[PDB]
Symmetry: C3
Subunit: 106 residues, 3 copies
C-alpha cells in the first residue's frame, strides 16, 4: 500500500476531488501554503493499493494544469509590475505504508 | 520509529488528543476535509517508537467511534417557495482511517542563540 | 528522494521558509496544533533528494530555535515552563516522485 501526497493549485482542487471519487479513491484534503509564494494551495492525501497508484497519478495528471500565478507584491512612485510565477499542475510524493487500519468501533 | 496518520471525526478530536497526552504520546493535528462528504474532519500525525505502535493504535481505536453522518442534501433549485427537507441520506463514517508509515530518521533540534 | 516532516514554531516559520528557498529547497506548510500545549504551530513538508537531506536538516536546525513556553490553564501560579524544541523532524522514504507540468 502507498500514501500519496499531491500538492495542487486551489483552482483544480474540486475537479480533482470529484475525479478521485469517481475513480473510487478515498482522499483527504488539507489546506496548505507554499514555501515560495506563501499563498494558499491544496494538499491531497490519497491512500491506495500498490496496483492502483498509477491510476491515481493519472487522475491527478489529467485534472491539474500548470499555470502562471501572480505573487503578492525612488523619489517618484511607480505602479509595480505584476510578478508572474510558473506553478506546476501537481507536486506528488508516493510514500510506502507499513500498515493500514480502519477502526469501526462503536 | 513510525509515523501514524489518522483521519478521525471532529467529534472525537478533543477526546483523542486528551487520551494521547494521558498516554504520553506526542501528536500534531490539523483540520482537514473528506474527499467524499466534503465536510470537516481532523487528521492526526503521531510519531512513536516501534515498541509503542500497538499502544497508540489502541488509544485511537478506543477513542474514535464509527457514526452515521448526513450527506449534504441536494442544492438543486426548485420553484416552490419553501425550505425543503427530503429524506435524510445517512453515510457510514468509520472511527478512524489510519496509515502507519516507516520513519527513516528522526531529529529533535534544540538549538538556542 | 525523502520527505521531511518538520514541526516548528510559528515564529520561526517565515525565516525557515526563506532559508529553504535560499538553499534551493521546495516546501509546503500546514497550519497545525500541538497536542500538549494545544497551541498553533507549523508543519513543513519538504521533499528533497537523498543526498541533500542533511543539508535541509542543517537549514532547519540553523533557523529554528528552542523557546520556553509557559503552562496555562483562584490565582496566577508560580510559572511553570516547557521547552518547545526548534523542530521535531521525521524523515520518510519516498517510493516515487512526480512533477506534472501539462498546461
Ligand atoms: N526559487 C524558487 N524556489 C521555489 N519555487 C520557485 C522558485 N522560483 C520559482 N518557483 C516556483 O514557485 C512555484 C510555487 O512554489 P510554492 O512553494 O508556493 O508552492 C509549491 C509547494 O507548495 C509545493 N512543492 C514544490 N516542491 C516541493 C518540495 N520539494 N517539497 C514540498 N513541497 C513542494 O508544490 C507547490 C508548487 O511547486 P512548483 O515547483 O510546481 O511551482 C513552484 C516553482 O516553479
Ligand atoms: N521492545 C521493542 N519493541 C520493538 N522494537 C524495539 C524494542 N526495543 C527496541 N526496538 C528497536 O530497536 C531500536 C532501538 O531501540 P533503543 O531502545 O536502542 O532506542 C529507543 C529508545 O531508547 C527510545 N525511546 C524513548 N522513549 C521511549 C519509549 N517510551 N518507548 C520505547 N523507546 C523509547 O527510542 C529509541 C528509538 O526507538 P525506535 O523504535 O525508533 O528504534 C528501536 C526499535 O526499532
Ligand atoms: N463512494 C464513496 N467514496 C468514498 N467514501 C464513501 C463512499 N460512499 C460512502 N463513503 C463513506 O464516506 C465516508 C466519509 O468519507 P470522506 O471522504 O468524507 O472522509 C474520509 C477521508 O477524509 C478519510 N479517508 C478514507 N479513506 C481514505 C484514503 N484511502 N486515503 C485518504 N483518506 C481517506 O477518512 C474519512 C472517513 O473515511 P471512511 O472510509 O471511514 O468513511 C467514508 C465512507 O464509508
Ligand atoms: N507529556 C509531556 N510531559 C511534559 N512535557 C511535554 C509533554 N509533551 C510535550 N511536552 C513539552 O511540550 C512541548 C510542546 O508540545 P506540543 O505537543 O504542544 O507540540 C509538539 C507537537 O506539535 C510536535 N510533536 C512532538 N512530539 C511529536 C510526536 N511524537 N508526534 C507528532 N508531533 C509531535 O512537536 C511540537 C513540539 O514538541 P517538543 O517536544 O519540542 O516540545 C514539547 C515538550 O517540551
Amino acid at each position: 500500500m502507498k500514501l500519496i501526497f499531491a500538492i495542487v493549485q486551489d483552482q483544480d482542487s474540486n475537479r480533482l476531488s470529484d475525479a478521485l471519487t469517481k475513480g473510487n479513491f478515498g482522499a483527504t484534503k488539507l489546506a496548505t501554503t507554499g514555501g515560495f509564494l506563501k499563498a494558499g494551495n491544496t494538499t491531497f492525501i490519497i491512500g491506495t493499493e500498490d496496483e492502483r497508484v498509477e491510476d491515481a497519478l493519472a487522475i491527478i495528471k489529467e485534472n491539474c494544469k500548470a499555470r502562471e500565478q501572480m505573487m503578492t507584491p525612488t523619489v517618484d512612485t511607480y505602479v509595480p509590475y505584476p510578478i508572474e510565477v510558473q506553478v506546476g499542475g501537481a507536486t506528488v510524493f508516493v510514500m510506502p505504508v507499513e500498515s493500514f487500519h480502519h477502526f469501526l468501533e462503536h
